Amino acid sequence: GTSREDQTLALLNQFKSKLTQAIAETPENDIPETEVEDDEGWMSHVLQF
Amino acid sequence: GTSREDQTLALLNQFKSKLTQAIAETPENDIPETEVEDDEGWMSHVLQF
Amino acid sequence: GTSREDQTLALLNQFKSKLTQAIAETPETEVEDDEGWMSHVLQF
Amino acid sequence: GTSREDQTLALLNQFKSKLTQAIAETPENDIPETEVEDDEGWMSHVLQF
Amino acid sequence: LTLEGIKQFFVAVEREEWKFDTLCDLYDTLTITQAVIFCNTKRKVDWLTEKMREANFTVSSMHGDMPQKERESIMKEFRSGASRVLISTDVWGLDVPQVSLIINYDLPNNRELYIHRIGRSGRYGRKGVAINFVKNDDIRILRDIEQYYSTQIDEMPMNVADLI
Amino acid sequence: LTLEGIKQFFVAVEREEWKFDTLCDLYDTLTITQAVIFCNTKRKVDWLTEKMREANFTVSSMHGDMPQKERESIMKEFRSGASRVLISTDVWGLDVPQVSLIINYDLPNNRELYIHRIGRSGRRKGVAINFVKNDDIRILRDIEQYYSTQIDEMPMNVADLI
Amino acid sequence: LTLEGIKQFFVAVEREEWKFDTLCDLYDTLTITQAVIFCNTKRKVDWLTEKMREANFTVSSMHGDMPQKERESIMKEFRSGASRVLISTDVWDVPQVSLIINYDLPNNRELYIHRIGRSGRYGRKGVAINFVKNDDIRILRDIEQYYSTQIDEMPMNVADLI
Amino acid sequence: LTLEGIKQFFVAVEREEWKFDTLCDLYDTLTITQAVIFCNTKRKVDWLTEKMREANFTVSSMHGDMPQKERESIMKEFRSGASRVLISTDVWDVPQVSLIINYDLPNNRELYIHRIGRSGRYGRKGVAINFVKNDDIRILRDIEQYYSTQIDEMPMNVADLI
Amino acid sequence: AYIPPAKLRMMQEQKNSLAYQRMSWEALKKSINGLINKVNISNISIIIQELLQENIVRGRGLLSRSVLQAQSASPIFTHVYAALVAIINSKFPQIGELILKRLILNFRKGYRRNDKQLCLTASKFVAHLINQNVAHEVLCLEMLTLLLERPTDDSVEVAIGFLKECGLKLTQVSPRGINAIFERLRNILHESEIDKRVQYMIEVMFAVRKDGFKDHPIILEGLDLVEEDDQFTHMLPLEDDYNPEDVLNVFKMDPNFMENEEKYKAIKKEIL
Amino acid sequence: GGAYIPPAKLRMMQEQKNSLAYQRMSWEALKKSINGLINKVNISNISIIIQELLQENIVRGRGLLSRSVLQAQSASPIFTHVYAALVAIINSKFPQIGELILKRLILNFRKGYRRNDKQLCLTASKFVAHLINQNVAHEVLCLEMLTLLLERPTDDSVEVAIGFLKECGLKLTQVSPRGINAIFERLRNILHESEIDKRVQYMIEVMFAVRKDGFKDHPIILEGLDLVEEDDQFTHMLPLEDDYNPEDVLNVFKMDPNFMENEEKYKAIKKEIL
Amino acid sequence: GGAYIPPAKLRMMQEQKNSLAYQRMSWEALKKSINGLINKVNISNISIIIQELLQENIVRGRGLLSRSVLQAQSASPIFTHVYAALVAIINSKFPQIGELILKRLILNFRKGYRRNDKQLCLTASKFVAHLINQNVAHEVLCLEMLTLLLERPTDDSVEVAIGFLKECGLKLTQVSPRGINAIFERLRNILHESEIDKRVQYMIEVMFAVRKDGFKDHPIILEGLDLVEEDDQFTHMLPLEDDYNPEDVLNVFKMDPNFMENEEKYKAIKKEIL
Amino acid sequence: GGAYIPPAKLRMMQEQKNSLAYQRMSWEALKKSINGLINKVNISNISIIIQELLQENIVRGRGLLSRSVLQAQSASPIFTHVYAALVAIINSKFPQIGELILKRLILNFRKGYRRNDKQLCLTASKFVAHLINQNVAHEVLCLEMLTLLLERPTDDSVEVAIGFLKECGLKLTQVSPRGINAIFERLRNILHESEIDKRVQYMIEVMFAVRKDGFKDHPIILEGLDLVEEDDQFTHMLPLEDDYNPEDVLNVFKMDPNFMENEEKYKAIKKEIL
């Protein structure tokens, strides 16, 4: 019940920590110019269809 | 079928009576000169574009 | 066999004669209840 | 109950498959002579304290 | 699903003994393309199809206990017109356009199944006839269902042959 | 109606015996969202729907003898995704955008029905497969010439060419 | 061709992002019989017709690359009233056009008159709205003086001036 | 009894005030399975066990005045692992003792070997820490010469030398 | 309000002459209606024999009207109805002639009055009665010629639906008639102004001809129950003036009632 | 007066509860949404446009939808038919909107007839014709209008009357053959025993020709717009002569204390109206 | 290249006593059978398709089944739910296949996100949502995906996130109410404190409307697909960010020396799995 | 090298303002506090030490806590059970730290197995057993370990397997009877069909005796350590063979720019975790 919710929110907070820190090390998320890779650079990337 | 049409013709004859009596009560439909109102004087009026 | 078909087509030709001659004599009508059928055309 | 046991035994069978197949590709488990590595070559190794 | 447009009738069979005698009489006075007969129990559907085949009816029987695959094989037979009546208990509207008439040989003890038996979906809704075999015990449930579904069920007249 | 953009293929099944076994094989090698199977006769459509349901297919059947209102009620079931294949004879474009495939289990007897089966109204680019037998190849190259289009022999590589 | 009598307006869209949002707002405040919207590029015309059809507009699309014979068939569809919007670039016959929208301002100036202008003393009087951005404003009053016409800033009261 | 093999250390606590703060620091830098803490008086062992239990230590206390049978019954509790620290004065049985700490140097010297020393040739290679104050250094270098052993000043690097 | 029949048997009981005639008439009507509601392919024989046990010659108009009402309301089973007729006509030809006459007048009435569903049902019934050798093939050809002389969309549709049912019989019996019909169909397909949908159905009609009407057989297996030498094929042209004899549907007292009933029982005990 | 501002730049200016300003904002948004949807309607998108319209609170804003539909029909008569179909759908679900539209349309027609406003006469008559074709209004209205136009016939009156008859003649023939026969008898009587221009005489002759064809060039409803079954439609019977209140107050905003309650109630019936 | 030949014409060419060539033939036959079954699956036939799939050695071909299910879901998202249900059944008996499908699905979603592949994002997100609904994957995955999409939100990111939430919102509400409440709070904040297009604000409004409706148009699992009881399901916990190996080598045939023995072992397990 | 200094003698030297030096000082202080707390833990004080440990930012120092617990368990196996109990509590509030310790423990066990490190094998196996008992790890880990040890059994391998089974056999019997029965049948077959030393016969016989005794000397969890109910525990399932990253970089200090924000966030989570 509430235990599962505490645990899921803890995992989510760890993810948010690893996420907000991954955009810091990426070269200036305001103006980055990278290659079009085939695997992933995903954690920092943003969507533009 | 025929019932609806009997009723419709009854309503139509009632309308024609209310129309011809309005043509009777209008001030001399041969030579009437009125103003250009904004609502209606319609039942006696005739079309002249 | 073929005798039956010859006889059948003779009857059919008599009907077609009465039909093409029935379309000549037809003249807006009313909706009758029995028949005016030989001339009528279908419009559902 | 029994569902958890079926699932755990399925995972165990997967492990046994990956294990018995790991002994085939290793160089002759009867007489292998390798180096003393620091990480792992574990799936084929046998214990000799 | 709803009941608006479905002409709903009931006949005072007064007790079970005359129910069949009523059903047959209906077939002697009405014009039926195909029909679906609904009864509550499985023993009753078995008895009714066995006695109707004896009366030279082409009937297919169905109940909720058969697998979801054999009931397809019998309803395929009923839809093909091999049988002209289908007697069944509650399993589900229906998927047969040729059903001129639906008979509740028994009124449902639990009411909220009635709409699964007689009700039709608007798009595929065919104007049909439903006849309820009510006994003196079933009269209590009969007009208890009229207010919940807000529909109306009229006592069948002898003139019903001339009012579809 | 036109055929432009619709990839048209044919496979030399060579005789009726191998038609069904081919159809099944197609379902074992292709990726199909939904499909429409066309047969000439209604008895063939009945047999095929029964034989596909035997193979645990979710099928809806349709033929020109049913009323113009029950056919709508069957295509509503097929469009809802309750069935994933629609087997039918000649009745009409179609009313399903997600149909990955159209299969002519039978080639049309007369040529002028072909475009009513696979053609699209106002050309979705789709794929059509024709089951041609050694007797049907004459009608194949009558339809290739009449509509001035081209139908290519399907390759084993067709799985990698959608 | 001339511009006399044609009510000409412009709206300060200020940048491209708000162009579409303005167009929709126009359709929410004006009464339009039919309209033809002009854009500069062909990719832009395609993008706009696809994004407007998403908003459930009845649209026909046109660009200068298709042959002079198929666009006859597209404008025949638009004239029949099957579609109520026509998006096109510059290529050059519809009395029902209540409004003309330049979604893009014309790149070279003298094409504007081919878009909005009317031929001869007898010609249909219409209304034109120009989507001007802060970069395009330079051409706006560059075109007003050449043809000696007037383009007024659209008012909030425009709903009462047709 | 002898001292060979017992790693012997001392730390300059400089005065009594810093002894406890040092002891705690040891538990923050060393890995201790169980330990035996030696004090001279019963006053100090009582006070020290009270302060360690206050710090949430699992402690068993022992002194020379209780009967020789109740002290065995207390050491049975300490050997069972119920407590992970045993603080006691000099009395007259635990292999799991990773550490022996002389919270005090023994006032008279001849008791030192009875506290940290081991019985036979192979009892246990262990570590002993002596809490020496600026007044205690004389007793330190009386004990170093009497037993002819050497006690080294503990390094901060001791964590990597067990 | 209707009351179930059991509670009706308690009201009155009869003693076998004047008042009786109406009771037996109503019982015959109900029995015929029930049997016609019951008939299908699997039970055609037992329904035939139970019907033959009833006085269907005295109530010949009643049986005719019952069969026609059932077919008009439930066309899905027309073929089996035709088969039923084909049996009774083989034993009592006057009843078959009566049914055919009233059906022809029904078709003509619907055709003149532009009654779509009735035209479709009556045409299907006549087609399957020709298939059963109950009526002469002349009727089909005359109907198609009428429908196709000055063709409209609806006329062509009904004609094509009618041809689908009886085309195989027409091909076997009168090949020149049906190929002439198809030649007219091609000529109308090209040089006649008509909707695209009906052109589509004309194309599928030509496809069906190429298939040889295999989806529309003459008689389904289980209903070909009278061999050619025992059937009586009535020849009723389309145009002849017929009296449907509605007077046969109303009750009338006959002085030789019991004698006529016994005579029917004696005639029935010979034909099995 | 005042300069027009794009909506994006207006959302940047102010932002907003159950307050009054919310009611006014939602009122204007409803007006704009309805106007846009009515501008969008055509044959290919009628069904989805109907369902999108039903998402809006059409009971509170029934007058807005009514006057918007009437404005669109008056300005673009080429689409009267589809507009009628749209009404025929909403009238099948909310009859009060159909009755309201019919009332103001009849009042508009009478005003135009009195004021000799030609184009308005033509548009209103075409709308009435196509609403009769869609079974929204009772056939009495048509017959009363034709007799009115043909009682004291002039060139323009007969022209407008026959143009209206072209639109509603097939429905009138199917529903009331004797009434339309009276209309045609009056047309013949004016053709012969009345002084008229040669043009209108020719138009009467071609009208008789059109009647002989059975109005096949003017069908009831073109394929794609017969979307309400006869048994489910509600045909309002509004005679021509009755005095109607246009209920103009429905076009002006008013605060209702049960605002959110009424909005949720409309959503609850909408989750039923499919 | 080369012309395709029907299989009947192939059986006349060569016939095969079993080991290497048999393994290759049986591998291709298993691939074809699995592909056909995945093409056949629907709600009305889920049970028979399950048992027929279990008759095949799906643990030996777990990569084949994984690839076929993912291809079917990517090409036919209309059936994602039933696909998930299928997984939910097999995962209840062979959890390794569920873990494999889940890991490659996560890598697919991440690849699409990185590559700005719209359709792949939508399909993978819908698959993740319905696998969450079937208790095959842990709900943490949803919440991290939504936080990723909404941290620096763009129009397209908000669109894909709102479409994803539509499918799994009811499950998230039942299992983790505070997480979904945080998601909705962020949605409100972006609706207000950000400059945005009218369409995307409308999408946020319809999301709030669906939450107010209680996801009545997006149930957890449709009636007929709740076939694994909570106590019998094996819910895999695979976070979004973890580094996974999709084990593509499991899709390529390899000879195993104890082939017939392990095949008999699987047959013995199949005579146990009902 | 260099002489050790008491911490008190350090307070006179330097004093420090959330800059970098504060972060590093607090990192060293957290490491020392965690080490002390892990040295203090026992059965009688588990609750108070748990709450005092939760007062520290164990998410920031999850690698520190993991390696500290692992070191303490490796050096003092007599207390494995209580260590496991500690994990079972913290893992119930922060599953990520339990996953970290479990991954590094499995990797340690595999390293010891490969390197023939007896004491390390025994220690890691005992820890895994008691983590299985506390519902922290999935039972598959046990069964895989026993199957590995007993596939090609040697004297030392059978010793390690039997010592491992002694600790977790009762839990395995309650949870997976068929697996442990397979283990016992294999044990009998080695007792009979293999030539062996007297020691391994004694160990197998005493294991069968312990099974006959019902593991009365090896309970699942000692009275005083059943502190999280099954429904509140998060059982991580990590197979033995999977490739794991021990994430040693989490044991070394690194500056995070949002340090104080994260610390206050953890303080709020601590005011939530009781």
Swiss-Prot record, chains A, B, D:
This is Spliceosome-associated protein CWC27 homolog. It comes from the Eukaryota. It is found in: Nucleus. Disulfide bonds: none annotated. Belongs to the cyclophilin-type PPIase family. The gene is CWC27. Residues 27-41 have a biased composition (Acidic residues). Part of the activated spliceosome B/catalytic step 1 spliceosome, one of the forms of the spliceosome which has a well-formed active site but still cannot catalyze the branching reaction and is composed at least of 52 proteins, the U2, U5 and U6 snRNAs and the pre-mRNA. Recruited during early steps of activated spliceosome B maturation, it is probably one of the first proteins released from this complex as he matures to the spliceosome C complex. Component of the minor spliceosome, which splices U12-type introns. As part of the spliceosome, plays a role in pre-mRNA splicing. Probable inactive PPIase with no peptidyl-prolyl cis-trans isomerase activity. As a component of the minor spliceosome, involved in the splicing of U12-type introns in pre-mRNAs. It comes from Homo sapiens. It is linked to Retinitis pigmentosa with or without skeletal anomalies: An autosomal recessive disease characterized by retinal degeneration, brachydactyly, short stature, craniofacial dysmorphism, and neurologic defects. Retinal defects are consistent with retinitis pigmentosa in most patients. Neurologic manifestations include mild-to-moderate intellectual disability and psychomotor retardation. The lineage of its organism: Eukaryota, Metazoa, Chordata, Craniata, Vertebrata. The chain holds residues 378 to 426 of 472 of the full protein.
UniProtKB/Swiss-Prot annotation, chain F:
One of its GO terms (molecular function) is poly(A) binding. It is found in: Nucleus; Nucleus speckle; Cytoplasm. There is a cross-link at K69, K125, K133 (Glycyl lysine isopeptide (Lys-Gly) (interchain with G-Cter in SUMO2)). One of its GO terms (cellular component) is cytoplasm. Residues 5-162 form the Helicase C-terminal domain. It comes from the Eukaryota. GO terms for biological process: associative learning; cellular response to brain-derived neurotrophic factor stimulus; cellular response to selenite ion; embryonic cranial skeleton morphogenesis; exploration behavior; mRNA export from nucleus; mRNA splicing, via spliceosome; negative regulation of excitatory postsynaptic potential. Transmembrane segments: none annotated. Ubiquitously expressed. Changing E153R: Loss of incorporation into EJCs. Changing T89V: Reduced incorporation into EJCs. Keywords: Acetylation, ATP-binding, Cytoplasm, Disease variant, Helicase, Hydrolase, Isopeptide bond, mRNA processing, mRNA splicing, mRNA transport, Nonsense-mediated mRNA decay, Nucleotide-binding, Nucleus, Phosphoprotein, RNA-binding, rRNA processing, Spliceosome, Translation regulation, Transport, Ubl conjugation. ATP binds at D95, R120, S121, G122, R123. The keyword Phosphoprotein applies. The modification N6-acetyllysine is found at K51, K76. Its main location: nucleus. It is linked to Richieri-Costa-Pereira syndrome: A syndrome characterized by a unique pattern of anomalies consisting of microstomia, micrognathia, abnormal fusion of mandible, cleft palate/Robin sequence, absence of central lower incisors, minor ears anomalies, hypoplastic first ray, abnormal tibiae, hypoplastic halluces, and clubfeet. Learning disability is also a common finding. Belongs to the DEAD box helicase family. eIF4A subfamily. This is Eukaryotic initiation factor 4A-III. The gene is EIF4A3. The chain holds residues 246 to 411 of 411 of the full protein.
Swiss-Prot record, chain I:
Residues 29-212 form the MIF4G domain. It is found in: Nucleus; Nucleus speckle. It comes from the Eukaryota. Component of the pre-catalytic spliceosome B and the catalytic spliceosome C complexes. Component of the minor spliceosome, which splices U12-type introns. Interacts with EIF4A3 and PRPF19 in an RNA-independent manner. Direct interaction with EIF4A3 is mediated by the MIF4G domain. Full interaction with EIF4A3 occurs only when EIF4A3 is not part of the EJC and prevents EIF4A3 binding to RNA. Belongs to the CWC22 family. Required for pre-mRNA splicing as component of the spliceosome. As a component of the minor spliceosome, involved in the splicing of U12-type introns in pre-mRNAs. Promotes exon-junction complex (EJC) assembly. Hinders EIF4A3 from non-specifically binding RNA and escorts it to the splicing machinery to promote EJC assembly on mature mRNAs. Through its role in EJC assembly, required for nonsense-mediated mRNA decay. This is Pre-mRNA-splicing factor CWC22 homolog. The chain holds residues 132 to 406 of 908 of the full protein.
